[PDB]
Amino acid sequence: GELSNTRLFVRPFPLDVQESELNEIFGPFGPMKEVKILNGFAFVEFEEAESAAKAIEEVHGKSFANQPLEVVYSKLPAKRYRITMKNLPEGCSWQDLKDLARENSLETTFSSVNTRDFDGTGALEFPSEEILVEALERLNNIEFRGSVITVERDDNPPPIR
Numbered sequence: 171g172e173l174s175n176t177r178l179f180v181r182p183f184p185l186d187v188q189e190s191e192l193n194e195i196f197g198p199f200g201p202m203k204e205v206k207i208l209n210g211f212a213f214v215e216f217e218e219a220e221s222a223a224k225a226i227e228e229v230h231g232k233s234f235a236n237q238p239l240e241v242v243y244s245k246l247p248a249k250r251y252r253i254t255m256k257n258l259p260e261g262c263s264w265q266d267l268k269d270l271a272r273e274n275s276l277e278t279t280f281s282s283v284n285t286r287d288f289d290g291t292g293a294l295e296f297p298s299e300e301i302l303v304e305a306l307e308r309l310n311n312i313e314f315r316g317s318v319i320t321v322e323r324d325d326n327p328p329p330i331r
Contacts, residue, residue, distance in 0.1 A: 173245060180212035180240070181211070192214060253324070254294070256319070257320055260317070267283065276308070
């Protein structure tokens, strides 16, 4: 096999979505074999697997256009251990959900919430499936602050293309 090795998928950039920024950003990483910038998604293929593998862990989590950047290995996996919550109109936050989660016999490695809007929805992930299914069945349909919160897994693996 010679597929996955040099290709990093970036998030959608604003009106400033051009190779100019991609080069000025991914520049200090290695000889970019090629670059792609489309309204909605970006891609960058390095001439060296190392340069790519690094840029993926470097660029990922960066800042640009007053927004958090995101980069990954242009590719798709299978199965996961994360779930999303709904009907949770509360402030908690990652710290809150993480506190109750760990206290409820549920260890998580990643957490996220949505405070920007009043949708009242969050998302958590566990290191193992056991905790996922357990926490999902233990959290599914629960009364809290006079509100019934529910948890449901949501897998969104990029199209096969």
